[PDB]
Amino acid sequence: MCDAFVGTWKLVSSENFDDYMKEVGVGFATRKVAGMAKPNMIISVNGDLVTIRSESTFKNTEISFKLGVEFDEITADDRKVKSIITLDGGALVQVQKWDGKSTTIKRKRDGDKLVVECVMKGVTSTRVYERA
């Protein structure tokens, strides 16, 4: 399950992430630190349970989830959200909902890349990772 996503991924490019974070509501200082971070993303699967870790000097976070089962999450910027992650067309699609708001984070395999597209109210950020 989700075999293609398994690995340790290193950030190679980031586009429009500051604007994305502004739209989400991330504070100025936090945006500054999060933006200069070069996280690794470590994805693993154990049976039906997927784990995604994000590691950097900014923060270390981890989520463990089952596809299609809503779960509670504290994000790296300290929002308490309800998250649902689905596999749609080979892409892992995560929707986070909080305070009447929503954002979508799509993780897709493209060649030897993992491409992460984050969208909120039509503001989009794209982060590309490659295997470490």
Curated annotation (Swiss-Prot):
Subcellular location(s) of the protein: Cytoplasm; Nucleus
Pfam family, one: Lipocalin
Keyword Cell cycle listed: no
UniProt key word Cell inner membrane: no
A GO term for molecular function: hormone receptor binding
Effect of residue 67 to A: Abolishes export from nucleus
Record-listed N-acetylcysteine modification sites: 2
PROSITE patterns: FABP
Taxonomy, superkingdom: Eukaryota
Nuclear localization signal, short sequence motif: residues: 22-32
Gene3D superfamilies associated with the record: 2.40.128.20
Amino-acid positions noted as binding a fatty acid in the UniProt annotation, renumbered to this chain: 127-129
Keywords: Acetylation, Cytoplasm, Lipid-binding, Nucleus, Phosphoprotein, Transport
Listed GO biological process terms: brown fat cell differentiation; cellular response to lithium ion; cellular response to tumor necrosis factor; cholesterol homeostasis; long-chain fatty acid transport; negative regulation of DNA-templated transcription; positive regulation of cold-induced thermogenesis; positive regulation of inflammatory response
Phosphotyrosine found at: 20
Positions bearing Phosphoserine: 13
GO cellular component: cytoplasm; nucleoplasm; nucleus
PANTHER family: FATTY ACID BINDING PROTEIN
Protein's job: Lipid transport protein in adipocytes. Binds both long chain fatty acids and retinoic acid. Delivers long-chain fatty acids and retinoic acid to their cognate receptors in the nucleus.
Domain notes: Forms a beta-barrel structure that accommodates the hydrophobic ligand in its interior.
Subunit organization: Monomer. Homodimer. Interacts with PPARG.
Family label: Belongs to the calycin superfamily. Fatty-acid binding protein (FABP) family.
Stated name of the protein: Fatty acid-binding protein, adipocyte
Native source organism of the sequence: Mus musculus (Mouse)
